[PDB]
Amino acid sequence: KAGNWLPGSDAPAWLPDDLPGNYGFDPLSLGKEPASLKRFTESEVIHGRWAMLGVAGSLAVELLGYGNWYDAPLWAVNGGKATWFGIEVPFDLNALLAFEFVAMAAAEGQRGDAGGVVYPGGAFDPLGFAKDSSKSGELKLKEIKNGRLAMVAFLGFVAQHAATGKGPIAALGEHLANPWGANFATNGISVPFF
Amino acid sequence: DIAGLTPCSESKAYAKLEKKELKTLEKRLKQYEADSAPAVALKATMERTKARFANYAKAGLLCGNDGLPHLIADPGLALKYGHAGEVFIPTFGFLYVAGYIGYVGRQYLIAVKGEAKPTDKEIIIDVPLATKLAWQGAGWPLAAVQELQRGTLLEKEENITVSP
Amino acid sequence: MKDFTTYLSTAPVIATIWFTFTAGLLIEINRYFPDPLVFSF
Amino acid sequence: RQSWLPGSQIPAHLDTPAAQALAGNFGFDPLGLGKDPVALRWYQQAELIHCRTAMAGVAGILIPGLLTKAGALNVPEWYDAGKVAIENSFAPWGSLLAVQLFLCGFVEAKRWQDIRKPGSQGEPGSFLGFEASLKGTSELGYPGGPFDPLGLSKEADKWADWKLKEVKNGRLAMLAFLGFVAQKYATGAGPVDNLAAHLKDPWHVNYATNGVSLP
Amino acid sequence: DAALPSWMPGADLPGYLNGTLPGDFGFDPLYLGQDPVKLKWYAQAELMNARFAMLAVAGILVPELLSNIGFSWPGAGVAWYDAGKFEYFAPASSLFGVQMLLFAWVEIRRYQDFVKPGSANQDPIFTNNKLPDGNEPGYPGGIFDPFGWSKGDIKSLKLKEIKNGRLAMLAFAGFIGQAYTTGTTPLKNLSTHLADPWSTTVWQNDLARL
Numbered sequence: 001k002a003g004n005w006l007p008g009s010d011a012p013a014w015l016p017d018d019l020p021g022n023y024g025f026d027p028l029s030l031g032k033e034p035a036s037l038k039r040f041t042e043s044e045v046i047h048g049r050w051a052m053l054g055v056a057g058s059l060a061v062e063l064l065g066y067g068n069w070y071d072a073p074l075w076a077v078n079g080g081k082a083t084w085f086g087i088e089v090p091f092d093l094n095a096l097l098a099f100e101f102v103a104m105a106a107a108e109g110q111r112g113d114a115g116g117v118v119y120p121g122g123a124f125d126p127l128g129f130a131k132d133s134s135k136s137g138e139l140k141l142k143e144i145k146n147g148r149l150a151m152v153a154f155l156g157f158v159a160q161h162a163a164t165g166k167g168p169i170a171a172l173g174e175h176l177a178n179p180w181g182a183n184f185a186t187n188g189i190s191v192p193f194f
Numbered sequence: 195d196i197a198g199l200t201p202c203s204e205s206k207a208y209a210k211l212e213k214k215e216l217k218t219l220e221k222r223l224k225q226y227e228a229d230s231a232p233a234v235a236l237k238a239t240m241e242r243t244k245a246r247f248a249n250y251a252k253a254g255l256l257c258g259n260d261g262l263p264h265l266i267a268d269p270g271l272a273l274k275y276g277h278a279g280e281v282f283i284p285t286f287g288f289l290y291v292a293g294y295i296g297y298v299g300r301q302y303l304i305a306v307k308g309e310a311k312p313t314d315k316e317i318i319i320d321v322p323l324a325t326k327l328a329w330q331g332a333g334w335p336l337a338a339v340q341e342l343q344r345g346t347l348l349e350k351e352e353n354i355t356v357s358p
Numbered sequence: 359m360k361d362f363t364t365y366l367s368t369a370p371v372i373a374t375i376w377f378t379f380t381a382g383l384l385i386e387i388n389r390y391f392p393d394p395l396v397f398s399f
Numbered sequence: 400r401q402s403w404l405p406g407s408q409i410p411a412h413l414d415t416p417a418a419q420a421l422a423g424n425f426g427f428d429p430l431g432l433g434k435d436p437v438a439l440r441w442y443q444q445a446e447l448i449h450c451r452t453a454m455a456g457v458a459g460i461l462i463p464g465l466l467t468k469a470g471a472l473n474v475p476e477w478y479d480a481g482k483v484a485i486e487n488s489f490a491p492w493g494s495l496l497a498v499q500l501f502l503c504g505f506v507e508a509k510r511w512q513d514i515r516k517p518g519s520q521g522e523p524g525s526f527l528g529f530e531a532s533l534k535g536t537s538e539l540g541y542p543g544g545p546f547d548p549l550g551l552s553k554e555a556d557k558w559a560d561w562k563l564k565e566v567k568n569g570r571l572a573m574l575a576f577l578g579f580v581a582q583k584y585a586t587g588a589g590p591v592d593n594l595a596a597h598l599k600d601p602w603h604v605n606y607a608t609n610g611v612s613l614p
Numbered sequence: 615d616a617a618l619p620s621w622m623p624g625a626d627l628p629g630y631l632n633g634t635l636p637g638d639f640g641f642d643p644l645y646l647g648q649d650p651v652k653l654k655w656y657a658q659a660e661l662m663n664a665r666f667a668m669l670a671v672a673g674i675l676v677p678e679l680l681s682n683i684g685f686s687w688p689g690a691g692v693a694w695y696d697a698g699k700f701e702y703f704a705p706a707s708s709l710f711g712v713q714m715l716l717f718a719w720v721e722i723r724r725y726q727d728f729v730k731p732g733s734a735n736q737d738p739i740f741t742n743n744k745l746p747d748g749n750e751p752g753y754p755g756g757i758f759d760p761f762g763w764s765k766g767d768i769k770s771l772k773l774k775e776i777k778n779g780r781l782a783m784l785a786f787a788g789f790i791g792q793a794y795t796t797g798t799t800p801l802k803n804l805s806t807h808l809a810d811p812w813s814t815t816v817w818q819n820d821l822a823r824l
């Protein structure tokens with residue numbers, strides 16, 4: 001358990017307290033069947049892990065000054081000569097798209113339709129932290145919590161770019177340059193009236 | 195201009211025949227005083243006539259070699275070229291009323307067989323019953339297709355035969 | 359006069375009342391709508 | 400109980416316990432269209448969805464219409480708002496309606512099969528884990544689950560209220576749209592414009608002063 | 615339906631307005647609150663519309679009372695309908711964004727108290743601070759009562775709160791129409807009704823405008 005997400009609320013009986021990242025947050029009763037919940041615990045982590053990799057790649061471009069996350073696929077249209085760390089890579093769009101279709105489905109088919117496991121014991125733990133003895137559910141909780149923050153923050157990137165058209169650090173510097181005039185209400189999009 | 199035709203607002207034998215009819219009415223009108231009701235009637239005939247030609251050209255009716263309004267009874271050539279009011283609108287304006295009379299007459303016969311002697315109530319129409327089925331049959335396609343789904347519309351092979 | 363209303367509810371009398379209804383309805387419509395060859399608006 | 404005409408005999412196919420257990424049952428069926436029970440059950444599903452689309456529709460007509468006559472919007476009249484917002488757009492209307500009927504048709508054909516057999520889409524393996532929440536409730540037309548984010552369904556009392564409040568705001572909105580079409584043909588102005596015209600002169604500006612209540 | 619005080623003395627009663635609710639006199643001629651699931655909602659709905667009105671009428675009159683006396687404010691003498699266009703350190707959109715998040719805390723904190731009383735009195739981060747148990751929705755107490763009131767004679771204080779509240783809701787509904795017809799400050803409408811009380815009722819100002 002370790003949390004209630006709305007204090008005073010009852011907990012849903014179909015969410016076991018053993019599970020990492022549990023708060024009893026399912027107001028839709030969206031995981032009442034156990035097979036649906038078992039698929040969802042697989043899919044929350046993988047959405048969480050890819051977003052933690054996604055939100056880090058969106059920040060470290062602006063932390064290193066390579067435009068932003070929205071403009072990194074602006075070489076396939078309106079030019080070419082894609083960069084990475086400043087280094088050129090001489091691939092057009094239609095080759096690497098075929099490379100990332102074969103090789104990624106080759107890693108998906110080893111992952112997805114070869115079981116249902118989401119914490120694989122073995123080669124995906126190089127140093128060795130969670131040996132499933134005692135420190136497993138603690139670090140699994142942190143992988144969820146940092147992961148849930150990342151999925152919010154990536155959704156906080158797309159809606160921020162749909163509204164203002166600026167990147168993460170490019171408008172975080174603006175909210176710090178104007179605390180009361182560079183928020184989600186001064187644009188006539190998120191609040192339509194005032 | 196769909197099938198060798200022309201709009202009646204654009205053809206000239208149509209307008210020639212309009213001027214042919216109004217010529218015949220006016221040379222018939224000349225025999226009467228301008229106050230007389232045999233002339234009031236003929237000038238009212240003309241204003242029903244001239245509005246009739248105005249309304250046929252307004253709807254975009256198709257004339258041909260003879261200058262008469264030709265009808266196009268095909269959907270896809272009436273829906274495409276704006277002529278569904280010729281045939282394609284009254285082919286459902288009819289079939290509403292047609293199956294209406296069929297359904298009211300059906301429901302009157304179905305609801306008379308469970309009686310003492312139903313042949314008497316085909317002479318003497320039960321007017322409080324028949325008008326009741328007449329008003330409430332106004333959603334007859336909504337009632338028929340529900341009866342079509344059951345199997346209660348079609349009576350089975352209880353029907354009478356000779357030598358199959 | 360209940361027997362008289364049975365006579366008014368026979369087959370030819372309702373036929374000659376309803377046909378004066380249905381013709382008389384179409385006559386009044388074809389008076390106030392002169393010559394409907396095609397469905398206008 | 401509370402009939403549409405207080406003196407009428409309510410027809411007997413609205414007084415059965417599978418019909419008096421229904422929202423908006425005011426004894427109104429002067430054509431007898433729902434005498435068949437599954438035809439009542441099918442027309443009950445037609446009324447819920449003609450009214451919810453109308454409540455969403457009428458709130459897409461007067462709420463951007465009242466908030467335009469009061470300033471702070473520039474949404475035009477609803478009978479001309481289809482003409483605009485296609486140039487502030489990207490597809491032709493043919494290229495937009497076909498994707499619409501794909502998106503709407505996948506929904507409607509799932510609601511079709513759930514009417515035919517309740518709990519159709521709750522069978523396992525339909526969706527990708529999402530098919531569990533699609534059994535509806537014990538009565539159809541009210542799915543709940545992911546269609547109830549705020550969780551108003553789980554009461555079992557105050558529940559017939561929310562039913563009958565939905566239907567009455569729903570039936571009023573269906574007459575509102577049948578209004579909106581008719582008060583656009585007859586006068587060509589806006590519906591709030593017709594409300595402004597009736598308020599500034601009630602006793603001369605109405606449907607008795609146009610050519611559609613003609614003697 | 616007893617010897618309770620009544621809005622019309624001698625009139626018949628609905629029967630469900632016995633007296634447990636703060637300041638009732640049986641006034642419900644439209645029979646709106648027969649269902650107790652609606653009456654429990656309407657009681658809390660009365661208190662919130664009342665308390666925000668007592669904030670409103672004291673928030674309109676007192677900045678006008680101490681301005682027609684004449685003090686020095688950055689906003690002084692500006693009308694309550696003319697306070698929206700008045701500028702501040704920020705535009706009013708961003709101000710409304712702060713309201714719709716701070717109240718989205720407090721109202722949902724208050725609504726969670728309404729659906730289960732006795733289950734909202736705990737802070738998130740300070741898990742020692744709490745309001746004392748036994749309270750009812752609409753009267754939280756604890757830090758909400760810092761002066762140490764409501765330790766006796768709570769019914770008359772609730773009756774004072776609903777009577778000083780119902781007068782304010784009439785006063786703010788006064789403020790809407792009486793500043794919409796004549797278009798003045800509703801403290802200065804008192805000036806004309808005290809200049810010549812007999813030559814300006816609501817009727818003569820209606821009839822001059824009509």
Ligand code: CLA
Nearest residue numbers: 784785787788791792795803804806807814815816817819
């Ligand atoms: C809260 C009580 C209250 C008070 C003290 C006033 C006072 C006033 N209003 Mg007013 N008003 C009120 C409520 C109130 N109004 C409400 C609720 C509305 C909305 C319907 C209006 C709408 C309104 C308009 C449209 C106009 C006034 C006008 C006036 C002024 C002239 C007096 C008059 O014609 O009476 C008006 C009386 C009424 C409208 C009847 C309201 C009766 C209230 C609700 C109940 C009585 C309260 C209480 C028992 C008696 C007062 C004593 C109390 C304060 C101690 C005067 C300063 C006129 C003005 O500005 O001219 C100078 C004017 O044109 N008022």
Ligand SMILES: CC(/C=C/C=C(C)/C=C/[C@@]12O[C@]1(C)C[C@@H](O)CC2(C)C)=C\C=C\C=C(C)\C=C\C=C(C)\C=C\[C@@]12O[C@]1(C)C[C@@H](O)CC2(C)C
Nearest residue numbers: 025026027028030047050051054057058069072151154155
């Ligand atoms: C937000 C999200 C999911 C949100 C779902 C929520 C909150 C659901 C909550 C609920 O269900 C529960 C819990 C319980 C139910 O009862 C109730 C609701 C309320 C329904 C997923 C995002 C998931 C987001 C993900 C996975 C994002 C991945 C992004 C990646 C990989 C980005 C890559 C790039 O950015 C780089 C790296 C570099 C750039 O230049 C190029 C690109 C390619 C753009």
Ligand SMILES: CC(/C=C/C=C(C)/C=C/[C@@]12O[C@]1(C)C[C@@H](O)CC2(C)C)=C\C=C\C=C(C)\C=C\C=C(C)\C=C\[C@@]12O[C@]1(C)C[C@@H](O)CC2(C)C
Nearest residue numbers: 428429430431449452453456459460477480481573576577
């Ligand atoms: C669905 C509906 C309307 C939906 C409208 C929508 C979505 C509008 C959308 C738009 O506007 C917006 C949002 C924005 C615009 O820019 C674009 C469009 C697209 C234009 C109305 C239903 C309207 C439904 C109506 C009017 C139905 C009326 C039926 C009645 C009165 C029948 C009664 C009877 O059938 C019974 C009940 C019993 C029988 O026994 C007796 C009789 C009397 C026969």
